[PDB]
Predict the 3D structure of the following.
Amino acid sequence: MIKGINHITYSVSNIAKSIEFYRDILGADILVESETLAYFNLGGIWLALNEEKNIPRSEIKYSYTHIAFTISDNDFEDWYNWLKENEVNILERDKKSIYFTDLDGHKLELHTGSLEDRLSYYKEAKPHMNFYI
Amino acid sequence: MIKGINHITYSVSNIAKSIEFYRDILGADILVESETLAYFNLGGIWLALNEEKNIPRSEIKYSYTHIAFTISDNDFEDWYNWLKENEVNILEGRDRDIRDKKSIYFTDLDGHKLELHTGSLEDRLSYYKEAKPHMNFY
Ligand SMILES: C[C@@H]1O[C@@H]1P(=O)(O)O
Ligand SMILES: C[C@@H]1O[C@@H]1P(=O)(O)O
Ligand SMILES: [Mn+2]
Ligand SMILES: [Mn+2]
């Protein structure tokens, strides 16, 4: 049986610059680094970067695939301004969300809502969906 | 401050067969379904599938980007055998020292890379501190 999330690994083109992004902009706590890998604690999640210099990274911009992290409604504005302050690549009852990318186009989200919030909205607005809970 | 993981969302080309993959092979608990999306509990994580037509998905098999989920050492052979039984696209792992703990790498129907891993971050840091002198610790 799958017991929980273990780790998130991102392929990056420049470990040095990507480390700066995750550490200095998202506040990830660096644990180890070499020339080709870095590990972080980001919101209690084991984050790993592995440098891959020469792989194709053209198609990633087309996919809605992403990982959302939790922030407070209280820190929403503060995050938005900090990301804007840092020339971060921000993308344009659902609750609030900021979408952005790291340096290699990996889509990330800061979200203030819960699974319960989203289920309740869908029960009200979209009762034509199938609900199992 | 980032408080923790909120959800993981995959873009899928055929949501019907991606639902069967996550539900019937990985044992994700399905919560919601429409023609365009599906929500699961997988290992206490909010997992979302979003159907997207005509996105190019050929480059993804070249990237090491992936998400790893925890299984028990006790369940490792049963997981492996189960993914084999269901003709899952199991990938050739990297080379593995005993201290790296154990892993099964595979993809879903859209080539997203997944890992079943039996170790902790603590185990890896412990392995690397003893075996990896080209590494910096903090
Ligand atoms: C720790 C980073 O995911 C990689 P591994 O699967 O090569 O250990
Ligand atoms: C629910 C899955 O995250 C997607 P959303 O960002 O479209 O809400
Ligand atoms: Mn999202
Ligand atoms: Mn891994």
